[PDB]
Write an enzyme that holds these catalytic residues in place. Structure first.
Site, mmCIF file in Angstrom:
data_model
loop_
_atom_site.group_PDB
_atom_site.id
_atom_site.type_symbol
_atom_site.label_atom_id
_atom_site.label_comp_id
_atom_site.label_asym_id
_atom_site.label_seq_id
_atom_site.Cartn_x
_atom_site.Cartn_y
_atom_site.Cartn_z
ATOM 1 C CD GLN A 19 -1.024 0.586 3.239
ATOM 2 O OE1 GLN A 19 -1.980 -0.742 4.046
ATOM 3 N NE2 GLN A 19 -1.506 1.420 4.335
ATOM 4 C CB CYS A 25 -4.674 -1.229 6.106
ATOM 5 S SG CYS A 25 -5.976 0.131 6.593
ATOM 6 C CG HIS A 165 -3.150 -2.275 9.252
ATOM 7 N ND1 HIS A 165 -3.108 -1.132 7.986
ATOM 8 C CD2 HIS A 165 -2.309 -3.309 9.523
ATOM 9 C CE1 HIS A 165 -2.533 -2.131 7.572
ATOM 10 N NE2 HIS A 165 -1.878 -3.317 7.698
ATOM 11 C CG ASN A 185 -0.233 -5.604 6.396
ATOM 12 O OD1 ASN A 185 -0.858 -4.930 6.565
ATOM 13 N ND2 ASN A 185 1.276 -5.880 6.671
HETATM 14 C C1 2EW Z 1 -4.501 1.626 6.301
HETATM 15 N N1 2EW Z 1 -3.833 1.912 6.267
HETATM 16 C C2 2EW Z 1 -5.129 2.625 8.090
HETATM 17 N N2 2EW Z 1 -6.037 2.133 8.847
HETATM 18 C C3 2EW Z 1 -7.098 2.127 8.495
HETATM 19 O O1 2EW Z 1 -7.606 2.507 7.741
HETATM 20 C C4 2EW Z 1 -8.112 2.030 9.838
HETATM 21 C C5 2EW Z 1 -8.781 0.195 9.647
HETATM 22 N N3 2EW Z 1 -9.786 0.435 10.244
HETATM 23 S S1 2EW Z 1 -9.820 -0.303 11.431
HETATM 24 O O2 2EW Z 1 -9.826 -2.446 10.940
HETATM 25 O O3 2EW Z 1 -9.456 0.567 12.824
HETATM 26 C C6 2EW Z 1 -11.679 -0.962 12.253
HETATM 27 C C7 2EW Z 1 -12.638 -0.705 11.783
HETATM 28 C C8 2EW Z 1 -13.799 -1.393 12.353
HETATM 29 C C9 2EW Z 1 -14.345 -0.689 13.425
HETATM 30 C C10 2EW Z 1 -13.528 0.230 13.971
HETATM 31 C C11 2EW Z 1 -11.835 0.357 13.615
HETATM 32 C C12 2EW Z 1 -10.414 2.018 11.032
HETATM 33 C C13 2EW Z 1 -9.122 3.002 10.088
HETATM 34 C C14 2EW Z 1 -9.042 3.896 10.795
HETATM 35 O O4 2EW Z 1 -7.547 4.103 11.978
HETATM 36 N N4 2EW Z 1 -9.826 5.236 10.948
HETATM 37 C C15 2EW Z 1 -11.698 5.109 10.115
HETATM 38 C C16 2EW Z 1 -10.864 6.185 9.408
HETATM 39 O O5 2EW Z 1 -10.725 8.059 10.212
HETATM 40 C C17 2EW Z 1 -9.729 7.374 10.611
HETATM 41 C C18 2EW Z 1 -9.714 6.157 12.162
#
Ligand code: 2EW
Length: 218
Positions: A19, A25, A165, A185
């Site tokens: 990525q 992710c 993540h 991943n």
């Molecule tokens: C990936 N490279 C960065 N991380 C994300 O986009 C995370 C993924 N998800 S999570 O899997 O942490 C999650 C999923 C469902 C419910 C709660 C958590 C969330 C995403 C994330 O960190 N955010 C969402 C968009 O705004 C910032 C925080």
């Protein structure tokens, strides 16, 4: 339920993606789960467009943030709402936010609904993985022990259920007497073990792996 599952053995898992600096992710994790159903239903294995999700699901309608992060369940909802998603080969990954340029002529997969598993329930995760196929999940990937993962079952006490993540559970099994989830991943083939990690299974919902489980239906 089989002791060991591994969806690559059914040809349902595409190549590890990288990525880079784009917090995509979630997008990767979501295309992963839909690649698997798409093999499982049609018999073809086609890298799906994580860019298309980046570019097109960046509005309050979903709460996704493109390279800013977002949610595999909202990715699935965008496919449903949008009536399709393109393959990567026609809508390729650029590692940045761009204007939506989804073209339905190029639809390569569809979603009709998605399923969520109950929070924390590792037993429910195992069933899913076993009978449904790869499942999207969130992890606390924020520790150098994860980054620098080489082998064995990842089981660092410092992990938390504060997930950040999006990854894909493609299997499970037992290693030298430790249960694990086989996780794909999206950090390229230089991460962990061929771009995979084995993560503690049945160890108090380690790194919140079972907190936020979902997979799509075609
Ligand atoms: C990936 N490279 C960065 N991380 C994300 O986009 C995370 C993924 N998800 S999570 O899997 O942490 C999650 C999923 C469902 C419910 C709660 C958590 C969330 C995403 C994330 O960190 N955010 C969402 C968009 O705004 C910032 C925080």
């Amino acid at each position: 339920l089989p002791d060991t599952v591994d969806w690559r053995e059914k040809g349902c898992v595409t190549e590890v993606k990288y990525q880079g600096s784009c917090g995509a992710c979630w997008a990767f994790s979501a295309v992963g789960a839909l690649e698997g159903q798409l093999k499982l239903k049609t018999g073809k294995l086609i890298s799906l467009s994580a860019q298309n999700l980046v570019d097109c699901s960046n509005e309050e309608k979903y709460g996704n943030k493109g390279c800013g992060g977002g949610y595999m369940t909202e990715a699935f909802q965008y496919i449903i709402d949008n009536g399709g998603i393109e393959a990567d080969a026609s809508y390729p990954y650029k590692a940045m936010d761009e204007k939506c340029h989804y073209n339905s002529k190029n639809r390569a997969a569809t979603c009709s609904r998605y399923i969520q598993l109950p929070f924390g329930d590792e037993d429910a995760l195992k069933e899913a993985v076993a009978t449904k196929g790869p499942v999207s999940v969130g992890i606390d990937a924020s520790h150098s022990s994860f980054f620098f993962y080489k082998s064995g079952v990842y089981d660092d006490p410092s992990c938390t259920g504060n997930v950040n993540h999006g990854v894909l559970v493609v299997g499970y099994g037992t290693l030298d007497g430790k249960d694990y989830w086989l996780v794909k991943n999206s950090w390229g083939l230089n991460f962990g073990d061929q771009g995979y990690i084995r993560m503690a299974r049945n160890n108090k919902n380690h790194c919140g792996i079972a907190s936020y489980c979902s997979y799509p239906e075609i």
